[PDB]
Design a protein around this ligand. Sequence first.
Ligand SMILES: Nc1nc2c(ncn2[C@@H]2O[C@H](COP(=O)(O)OP(=O)(O)CP(=O)(O)O)[C@@H](O)[C@H]2O)c(=O)[nH]1
Length: 402
Amino acid sequence: KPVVAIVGRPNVGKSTIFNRIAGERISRIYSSAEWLNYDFNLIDTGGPFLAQIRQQAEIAMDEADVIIFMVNGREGVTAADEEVAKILYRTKKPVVLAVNKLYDFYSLGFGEPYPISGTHGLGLGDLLDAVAEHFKNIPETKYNEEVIQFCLIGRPNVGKSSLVNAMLGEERVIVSNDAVDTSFTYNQQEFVIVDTAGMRKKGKVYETTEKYSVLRALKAIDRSEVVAVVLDGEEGIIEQDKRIAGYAHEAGKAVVIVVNKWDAVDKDESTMKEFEENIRDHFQFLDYAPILFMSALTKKRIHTLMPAIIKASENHSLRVQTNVLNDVIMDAVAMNPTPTHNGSRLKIYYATQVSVKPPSFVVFVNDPELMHFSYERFLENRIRDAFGFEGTPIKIFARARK
Ligand SMILES: Nc1nc2c(ncn2[C@@H]2O[C@H](COP(=O)(O)OP(=O)(O)CP(=O)(O)O)[C@@H](O)[C@H]2O)c(=O)[nH]1
């Protein structure tokens, strides 16, 4: 059922590898070979220089679910490879990097490079595990890539439906028209609210336990890129709130914290500040998440919601230039020298971004064991000051050369 495409510039070995993994055409589409302990389909995308590659990658991004990006080892990172790379940045679909005919392929921004040789198929098993690992996250409801998908989550009666209503009443919104999702544009940009139906549940059904509502909300997050955590300003914070937010975080989604029912709280300057501090103390792992106070009922500050979601989404998607990132790491190191761990002091040789949604970074080191979690936090903070990243978690992995 899953579909795999091979993308690269010409003379890299696409046809060899492709013919190797292709079984027979179906009736262009080929299914996978018999020798593979893996079931999937391939799509051929082959037949100016930048304009023909433009066609291929486009076709893959629409048709394929997982894309293999092929470069040439013996040559290396050619500027021609760097162009194809730039094209593929245009997709939220998974890309695995293959290096044919076989160390700053990391400096192409797709993470670990999988060496192969279409000779006696060396390295192919690792390549296919990476490719296949994505098959489970293949969305069931598929939207256009320009669409920004988000969900609202929070306990019974926080005002999810009401916040939605209030959002959709603004002059800037045009609502369209799975009978679970709501589509609309805002400043003519496309959005989908995941699983609005689930918010409108009772009225056809008695909720009798929360346990199914929880699990369904988890599937809505899996489907989103931004999660609005909505808290009741009147009744405060509870245990269930931490858990669902916990999941969102561990899943690497952008997060915005929404405090609804602000109208129903005794407000002076202090109460807002204390409620904010309260949230930072209960949700210690969400410091990157901004906090919006509003009221779905009075419409106070409700016009701040969509801008914040747009911003969290952008930061979730952001790609840094490597040169700037390395300036920033080395600046962090100068200001704050690295710790020892028994005679041996951590050294950082180089950093690259390996992926987006959420942004992830690899720093090449001395030895990964020497990098304390607290120093990791510190490097994360320095990257935040330099680039922004409000509204998204970020990941830093330490790896050894070599
Ligand atoms: N004071 C105040 N009350 C609100 C606000 N938003 C919603 N309410 C009230 O809270 C109750 C729940 O609103 P509702 O939109 O159904 O919350 P929900 O979370 O969508 C309901 P479910 O949990 O079933 O999905 C309603 O009585 C509504 O009038 C608000 O901003 N301020």
